[PDB]
Structure of JetA:
Amino acid sequence: MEENTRQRTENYISAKNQHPAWILLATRRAPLVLSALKTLFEKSHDGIPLEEAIQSLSSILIEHVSQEQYDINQDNPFLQASRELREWIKRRLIVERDGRIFATDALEVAITFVESLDNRFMTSTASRLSTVQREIENLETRLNPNPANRVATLRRRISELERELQEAEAGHIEVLETHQAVEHIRDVYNLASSLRADFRRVEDSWREADRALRQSIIGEQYHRGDIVERLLNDQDALLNTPEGRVFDSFQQQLRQSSELKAMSERLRVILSHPSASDALNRLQRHDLRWLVKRLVDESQTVLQARARSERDVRGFMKTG
Amino acid sequence: DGRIFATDALEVAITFVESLDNRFMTSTASRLSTVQREIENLETRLNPNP
């Protein structure tokens, strides 16, 4: 379909004139600011404390003072860092939240773009095709409701695994070549890293939904009993909004203690293997080593972020 | 050859705006299942002990 094509131009004009990331990319000083921000958050576990961030930013400013054409300050690093950080918060690029600072989704996308723009390592690896093949293999074998097809698929899979077991019993096994392992490690890192990319879009979904709820209530005459069911209706509405729905299923899976613990153990043994150190620098390996911890804590943070809207029912209903 | 094709630059630029509001999402239980399965595969392959 192509009827929307007329409207898409207006949509893109909107995005250009308002969206944070795009506006950032158009600034005369875009690369310097984006690089500074990238470096700042490149070391984060979670939201960084305001003063830790201030120190790091002031130090980084010192490193780039030689770029004098941009009116970069040359006599006061802490004041400059504070001014710039305040401005960036004004740019809707980072959040005045809980004494810490987090990367707005706009910053996430701008980082992904520019960091994926120059001459670099590509977004893929030689192992991507194998992963896609396995994923399609599972997607088809599970979408197919014909039980006959499913049982036949299992009959052949079990035979393949039986071949493998017999081969190993006879004393023959196979392992990855070094560079093959390098590519697989890079593939793992590329995949798992994307899991973090959308938490703070779900956060914004909750924020916008809650602000829309409170905004529509400007009809002070509204029969307040509606919220007795709207308490469930908001949850249902966001449980079909792909953000909240997918995040809820993600939590449902994230609660499988055995699977997450096993995946962490496997990640540990993978990072231990020598090839790991070659595929990734120490920073990336440290990031991946505790990844499960990061996901757990970020999900819990987003939960306690939606928490604000949860109590809003009584704040709306009651008076006295 | 008389035809026209989009350079990689334009491909990436398109991928940028399309990753704005109308973007697709990856923080998914599906993605986690993929990563879990494929990490199992990677570990088992890297294990040399028969």
The first strand of chain A starts at residue 48 and ends at 49.
